[PDB]
Amino acid sequence: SVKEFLAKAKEDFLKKWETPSQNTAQLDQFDRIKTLGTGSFGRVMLVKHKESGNHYAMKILDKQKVVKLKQIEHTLNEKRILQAVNFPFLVKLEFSFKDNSNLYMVMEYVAGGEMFSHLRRIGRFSEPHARFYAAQIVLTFEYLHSLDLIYRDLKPENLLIDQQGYIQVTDFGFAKRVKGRTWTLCGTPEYLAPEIILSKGYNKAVDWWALGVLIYEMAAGYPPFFADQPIQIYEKIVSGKVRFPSHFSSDLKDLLRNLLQVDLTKRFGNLKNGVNDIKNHKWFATTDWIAIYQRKVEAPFIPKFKGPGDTSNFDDYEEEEIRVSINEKCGKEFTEF
C-alpha cells in the first residue's frame, strides 16, 4: 500500500533532511577521466575512485560561478535534497565534499547516456516506449511530491538511461522543499507551465504539466510548443492551444489534453484524486505500476555498453583542467554543503 510505503519513505527522508550528510570524500580519492556533460557553473566528469576501482559521475560546481548566477540557495537545495531521497528512478549520490574553489557531487555513473540523445537520434519513441518511461516519471513525482518536494526541471536532457534501460532522474538544481506556493522563474522554456510564465506563484502541478510536455516530446519527436526564441514559446504556451501528430492515439491525446491544461482546477495530477487520475487513465491501462516500481518490466531499449567506464553513449566535450585556488572561496555561503 502506497500510503504505508510513502509514510515510511517520508520518515527516512526527514531524518536525512534534518541531519544532512557532509564531507564524505575528497578530490584526490578519484582519477578524473572524461567530461560526460557540461553545465552552467561546471561540468560532470566520469571519474575512477582509487580505493574501490568503481566509476562515478563527478558533478563539479565552481562556487564563484554559482554565486555569479545567483544560484546559492538552489545549489544548497540540490545537495540537501539529493542526499536525503531514495527511489528506484532517482540517481544515487554516493559522495559529496567541497574545497577552496568547488563543490562536488559524486553520483552513480548512469552509463546509458541522456534520454535526449537517444530521442533525437531515433527521432521519436513508440507509445509503449514512451509509456514505459512516463510511468517511471509518474511514480517518481508521486514520491517527490509526497515529501513536499517540487522538481521543476523535467526534460529529456536530465533523464539518464541505466544499463537495464530504466530511467535515472538527475539534476535537482531547481528542486525545492516547499509547502504551498513558490515564485522563482526557473526551468526550461519549452517545459514551463503557463502559471510560471505569468508570474502567479505556483505549486507542484507545474511538474504534472512538464510531464505532459515530456510525454508529447517523447512520442512526437518534437515538443508541443516550440519557436526560435523563448518569447514566442511563451506565447504558445500561454495560448494552451496544442496540436498533435496524426499518429497519436486517441488515448494519448486525451491524457495530454488533461496534463497540458492551462486551468489548474482541471489539470490532471492536481485534482482531488491526485496522481490516481493519471495512473488510472486509459493510456496507462496496460501499465503494471507495481512491476515498474520493482523494475520487473522488460525495457524497450537497452543501451550498448562495453566496460564500466565506457562513455560511448555520451557526446564528447572540450576538456579543461580542474583548478583549485590556494584561497578559500565563498566559505560562509556554502558552510552547510
Binding site: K70, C186, G187, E190
Partner: peptide, 20 residues
C-alpha cells in the same frame, strides 16, 4: 511539416535552463 520546421529550428540541441 511540423517535424521539418522543428529540425530546421535553432532549438534542437540540448536546451539550457532559465532562472534568477
Amino acid at each position: 511539416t511540423t517535424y521539418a520546421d522543428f529540425i530546421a529550428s535553432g532549438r534542437t540541441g540540448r536546451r539550457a535552463c532559465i532562472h534568477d
